[PDB]
Design a protein around this ligand. Structure first.
Ligand SMILES: N[C@@H](CCCCNC(=O)CCCC[C@@H]1SC[C@@H]2NC(=O)N[C@@H]21)C(=O)O
Ligand SMILES: N[C@@H](CCCCNC(=O)CCCC[C@@H]1SC[C@@H]2NC(=O)N[C@@H]21)C(=O)O
Ligand SMILES: N[C@@H](CCCCNC(=O)CCCC[C@@H]1SC[C@@H]2NC(=O)N[C@@H]21)C(=O)O
Ligand SMILES: N[C@@H](CCCCNC(=O)CCCC[C@@H]1SC[C@@H]2NC(=O)N[C@@H]21)C(=O)O
Ligand SMILES: N[C@@H](CCCCNC(=O)CCCC[C@@H]1SC[C@@H]2NC(=O)N[C@@H]21)C(=O)O
Ligand SMILES: [Cl-]
Ligand SMILES: [Cl-]
Ligand SMILES: [Cl-]
Ligand SMILES: [Mg+2]
Ligand SMILES: [Mg+2]
Ligand SMILES: [Mg+2]
Ligand SMILES: [Zn+2]
Ligand SMILES: [Zn+2]
Ligand SMILES: [Zn+2]
Lengths: 593, 593, 596
């Protein structure tokens, strides 16, 4: 029966294709990824277990070598492939990291858009993904990106929901939480931060970088701004401070000044995250290293550059033989990169048309992980030919909102405003004007009400009046207004709707994404453990006479040969003929054409 | 096991088409399956012959006032319009209906002619099986064959003991009435077949082939006396019936008034008239013959009548209805059987010629009806489609060059070969017989001029014979020269080549057509009793998801559904997925493309 | 401008195809064009000079006394009407007339006009039936030209005022018709007189036809017996006929009946007898030869290439059967064959319009469908989705006949039994249903019309009960339809068509408007747009010109245009396509719409 359900998925996708891939570019008809051939050395996970998060932070600070986080399994494909990377390809390589690169600080492999996209577009459970990475890499810290009060969502959730999710995240295998607020509002971070400390995990509290500290004509986001936030985050209980440069705006000279001041303002270790949209982010990471930074993020070469992180292999190689040499074997970095390259070839459907570095990024400030999603939304609205006016709008809308930190979900709001402006030919002067009528997007109404928080100088008065159209704003923390969710009764609703008990993890999914989770859980009961399928089989099914080996449970491999596919019958059904371990099986599926 | 072989055939033809039908016109898709009408049976001419014997039966025919009818639909009808491609399945299934509905019929012409070899070579079916099914369906009617005298059912001369052997088997197989003819109207060559049919106590109906025009005084060679003498000669040779075989449909009404009055005066034997409707007036000649006392006439069912076939049975009967000689056939039943044949005919669209209607051109060329369409294609084969009227002029020229000879299988084919060559190479009667013009004749023209088909009245033309042979000719009977074949030896040969014993019938097939029989036997061993398949299935296999009912045998229907067809694999094989009586079956056949 | 107009036609059909041919089977690709047989001396006087000399009355006497059987060739009319939906073009028909004239000068006549040709020429072939007649008259000045004329219906399907019927006949004679075969669909002699008199006023031959139906040798069907026919022959003589025809439209006359019928007709009247039949049965030649044996004066046949099945039986083979006999027609068989080969090559161009008829059918003695309707009714059936139940329709046609009183079925009465049969199958009605009290039925317009009396009267009248139910309160009439019709105002209606066309018209065109106002109007506007497309050879008319194809078009007697299709543009932003022609060496560009 589990095997029968799988055959049903393979039939369906063989006959009808997959909605996300069928109408997009295909992989070359030509070679599956090969896991390189190799107990594992204890690493940062064991140390953290030994020391506890606070002392583990001190250890990082005192460590001379720069510490490396690999982002390939989350930000890398979030930024380059619409986050469509699958568990099968991610989990299959964890053991290789574990054996080959046991010195790594952490694998960023969770949170961001992965939680949402796994269930919705990939038909898979993010919690199972985490558990398979945990088992494959028992010696490395597993790191997630946590959106503070938004969790893994796009809306501010109630305090008890936020706390419940963090508890399950830590139970599921998360050792290191990078937590941020999209307005750098420390008050909105305290609930998350406290909950991370209560699970006795690493709270790496992030400060989002924007502007240019070395440009005295933008004083709002100056050095003092960052050094103060660092100090405040320490008082709030951070184990580590992160600079999250989501748009890749930090320049080398600025890094040199920033990381020095930061390490003088707080004793906590500093972790630096950036994107390579400019084509020079590697120079910034290196400058940060020269200036004492304790840890940096990079992506494997094959999923690096442009809107992703800068090249991990080339950064390591730049540091090779130096005092701060991170002690990672370049031959193994290459082998792993060659794996990800062959992996990436399978996701041709989701490539963007980004051709290289663009200094334009310093003008628009679009986050790396948003840039391509937003280019799609603009195509969607017939704007493809006017992309450069969109980027100009985004920068204009930013100034109109008071010049703000733009990261998920504040970035999406500027996005929605920018798109509207271009579509309807509206200038800043018109959007605010009293004599021009404007129906603002639900996201802009929401933010201007105070649903995402408060910037330094509040929100601009006049823009806020016209937007709310009678509504009274609020300036307090959103979670302080929200009602503690009835958890026992919220559980009953989902358990009644699935006609079965659920696990604590599944309930957490439901709290974050009730509709996505529900739809996903009903799909799972139909199609089975489709995450065990190789990626070409998942997206395109099986060719006539093609043989597939799939491991259903740990013990047992299923041998599936697609022998033949019928025409559509009078009742609208197609019959796919299979061999399962040398036994014949027919499976009927609907012709969705 | 016969089932597995049937599935092998159905798969083989579904995947590759039938070679005879693949590249030709297709029946209309909507297509109504032919429907056998709904109805012991009245004793008829079979029981009469069984009571009276052949001589007494001939007397009975003679004394009968009503004109007796032979239906030719089963044989000459489709030989002449559909290149003899009609299948046992469609033929046998209506036999019982003839038996119940038209019990007064003299006979069913259903065997001999081109059917014998065409069934095996082109339809993968045994002609003896066909005969026995008609016998079992029509136990009350005479079954009639066409026998080519010394040629048996071949195109060549066979030893006397072989001719004797084949007639014996044909009698065992169910043939009651033997129409026997010689291609030059030479009685000496007819003497053995006639003795063999008498020795087996069946009806010897000795035919005289009609050619020329008795009422034109500028053509004396084929005057009335020629035919009256040949009638008396064939009576002295022991005929029970005399036939006038007007192979090319050259007999005109006025000539019929004279010929048949004179014939019945010359002999006490009954007379049987066979013609073809190429001129579009042969029904007039038939009606004139009736009005002049002829005892029996041939017609074909409406739906397979006209043009190069026999004239319309239904309309003839209808013209006689109520007259002194009315044949006592129910017109409503002729109509119903004709509606059956119409639907059957539609299945054989692949084999329809382009013949538009009547042609008085027939009086010039004298091509037999049953050859006309064969030769038009043979000329198409040699790229002559565009000069068909020159080929027709060449056939008439050749005829005169050979001395104004009787044209019919196989002498007709000889003249055909000569005409085709003459046109190909732009050659006249003057060129073909010129002293200084080096030709290379067909292997059939030499053969004829040698003496292999026998002797015409005046012999062969001296000059045209020398240039053709180069080799002394013989004037004697061909069978007097052919050594008596060792039957016990030739039977051990075929039984070794097939590694199994054969029936007496099968050995007679071998004697007539060693190559075609050998190939058919082998194909039968591979594909099974394919003759039980309905005609669409036999020529085109099964549509995707199509359900066939086949009666592998009288006590057993099989239910066969084509559920799917695989792609061609790396061995070049194709797998067809059947459901046979509810059970999955997998048949591999080569991709012949 | 005439040339420019032709180019316009050629561009249009090249780009868009012809509506009649586009989606139908295509002729073979290579195709030898029809070759007109070479003749070079004058033409022997024939029946045309005889009628001019004697007048019709003395001509009929000459026919009667003439020992040899006389022949009418119907290939130019009934032949293709029956086999090719009457789609045969003037170009192919006129080109052989001269050959008939030089090579078969003993023919009684050429049946070359009337029937469906008048209508179809204009509507489906964009040509003028008068131009056709005139071109045939020019090419065969020694043979009688013969038409089928439908009596009260002219060359139409409706009934017309007397003065219009007369006016048409007058133009037909001016246009070149010598021999009018005139018939009434119910054999109602009263309905023929106006026609018969018009023909006599024009001093042409009036061949009054008796349509044959049933079986005179079947006493279980007395209504249509021997004397029914001999009495009509007598009344037609009294009414001024020069010749009596037996018009066996369905090919139902059998050989033994012909033997009795023609011996009797010759005894009953002093007029010559002329026999027309069809070969649907596959034995009509036998009936023709029986009629000759029994003394008939003339018979109709079709050239071999267009003979058989629903057409006439085979001219060449019939002539061959008579060769050397007492009544030998004196027609060279070799020339019959050469002319048949020409028609064969002609016919290959019309593959689009071939029916799927396989051969003879004794079924014809059941349904009694006319030969020149059989195929047309078979399309109607297909149209209504009834291809698969054709034999049901045929059974219903025979059922509908007996319900109507067992009538004569021929244009336009046959058209009405068709419509009734077609309705009966669709809606699964028996005869008992159609005449039922408690079953409401919406009859065809044509059937309401017939039972009212717009087609005239059969001998025993219409069935009372069935007429009540069909009319639904409408009072019927039994008088001659034309006696109730207001005399058309010919001066005023001439002004109407001349106003609509913004030009004066000819007497002939006017006669066409009177018969078919709508069709003629449409054809006259089409001609103003497209010019004299009748002069194009047939492949070019139906399929235009292939890429790079050179065509020689005889735009008139003197003058030949050389036309090459050099290129065809894509469809432009206004939905137009430009065809680049060379015309006599000069570049020309014609824009036509993309009709896709
Ligand atoms: N368009 C949706 C996203 C849905 C895409 C993937 N669908 C699922 O995960 C549901 C599971 C069942 C769908 C399978 S996939 C291929 C086979 N082919 C089909 O068309 N359906 C089945 C969104 O925007 O939310
Ligand atoms: C068909 C729908 C697929 C939508 C996702 C594509 S993937 C690449 C392009 N880049 C994005 O971020 N979204 C679109
Ligand atoms: N080309 C041959 C005529 C042979 C045609 C029919 N063949 C036989 O009777 C032999 C056995 C059947 C072969 C089957 S038929 C359909 C399936 N499709 C194929 O292409 N071969 C197999 C001649 O000229 O003699
Ligand atoms: N469908 C009409 C019959 C009309 C058929 C012939 N058409 C005409 O006679 C109109 C004159 C010009 C039309 C030409 S033909 C080819 C070119 N292609 C076209 O589609 N139109 C022009 C009916 O049933 O009444
Ligand atoms: N659209 C069209 O196909 C027009 C064709 C109308 C005449 C056809 S031709 C042969 C069949 N026989 C007929 O008399 N009418 C139809
Ligand atoms: Cl959701
Ligand atoms: Cl052989
Ligand atoms: Cl009209
Ligand atoms: Mg350090
Ligand atoms: Mg007798
Ligand atoms: Mg006479
Ligand atoms: Zn990032
Ligand atoms: Zn024959
Ligand atoms: Zn007619």
């Amino acid at each position: 029966d589990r095997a029968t359900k799988l055959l049903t998925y393979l039939a369906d996708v063989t006959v009808n294709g997959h909605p996300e891939a069928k109408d997009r570019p295909k992989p070359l008809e030509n070679a599956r990824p090969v896991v390189p051939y190799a107990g594992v050395k204890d690493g940062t996970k064991q140390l953290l277990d030994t020391l506890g998060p606070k002392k583990f932070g001190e250890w990082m600070r005192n460590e001379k070598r720069v510490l490396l986080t690999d982002t390939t399994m989350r930000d890398g494909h979030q930024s380059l492939l619409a986050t469509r990377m699958r568990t099968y390809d991610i989990a299959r390589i964890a053991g290789t990291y574990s054996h080959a690169l046991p010195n790594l600080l952490s694998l960023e492999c969770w949170g961001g858009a992965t939680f949402d996209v796994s269930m919705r577009f990939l038909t898979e459970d993010p919690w199972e993904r985490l558990a398979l990475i945990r088992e494959g890499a028992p010696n490395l810290l597993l790191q997630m990106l946590l959106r503070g009060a938004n969790g893994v969502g796009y809306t501010n959730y109630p305090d008890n929901v936020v706390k419940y999710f963090v508890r399950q995240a830590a139970k599921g295998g998360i050792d290191l939480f990078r937590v941020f607020d999209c307005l750098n509002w420390v008050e909105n971070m305290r609930v998350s931060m406290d909950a991370i400390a209560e699970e006795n995990k690493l709270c790496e509290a992030a400060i989002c970088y924007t502007g240019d500290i070395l440009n005295s004509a933008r004083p709002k986001y100056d050095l003092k701004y960052y050094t103060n936030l660092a100090v405040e985050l320490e008082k709030a209980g951070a184990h580590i401070i992160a600079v999250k440069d989501m748009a890749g705006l930090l320049k080398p000279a600025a890094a040199k000044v920033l990381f020095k001041a930061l390490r003088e303002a707080t004793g906590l270790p500093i972790h630096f995250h950036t994107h390579d949209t400019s084509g020079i982010a590697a120079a910034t990471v290196l400058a940060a290293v020269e200036a004492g930074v304790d840890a940096v993020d990079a992506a494997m070469d094959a999923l690096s550059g442009n809107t992703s992180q800068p090249c991990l292999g080339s950064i390591v190689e730049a540091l090779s033989g130096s005092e701060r040499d991170p002690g990672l074997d370049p031959a193994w970095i290459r082998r792993i990169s060659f794996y990800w390259e062959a992996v990436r070839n399978q996701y041709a459907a989701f490539e963007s048309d980004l051709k290289g570095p663009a200094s334009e990024v310093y003008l628009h400030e679009m986050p790396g992980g948003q840039f391509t999603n937003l280019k799609e939304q603009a195509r969607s609205l017939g704007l493809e030919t006017r992309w450069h006016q969109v980027a100009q709008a985004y920068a204009d809308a930013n100034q109109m909102f008071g010049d703000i930190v733009k990261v998920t979900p504040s970035s999406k709001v500027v996005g929605d405003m920018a798109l509207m402006m271009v579509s309807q030919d509206l200038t800043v002067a018109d959007v605010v004007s009293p004599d021009r009528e404007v129906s603002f997007p639900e996201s802009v109404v929401s933010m201007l009400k105070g649903d995402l928080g408060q910037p330094p100088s509040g929100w601009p008065e006049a823009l806020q009046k016209k937007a709310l159209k009678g509504e009274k704003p609020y300036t307090v923390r959103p979670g302080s207004l929200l009602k503690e969710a009835d958890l026992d009764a919220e559980r009953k609703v989902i358990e009644k709707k699935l006609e079965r008990e659920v696990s604590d993890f599944e309930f957490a999914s439901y709290l974050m994404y009730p509709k996505v989770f529900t739809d996903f859980a009903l799909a799972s009961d139909t199609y089975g453990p489709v995450s065990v399928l190789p990626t070409p089989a998942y997206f395109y099914g099986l060719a006539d006479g093609e043989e597939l080996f799939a491991d259903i449970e740990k013990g047992k491999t299923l041998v599936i040969v697609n022998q033949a596919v019928s025409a559509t019958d009078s009742q609208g059904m197609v019959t796919v003929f299979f061999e399962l371990n040398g036994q014949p099986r027919r499976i009927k599926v609907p012709d969705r054409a």
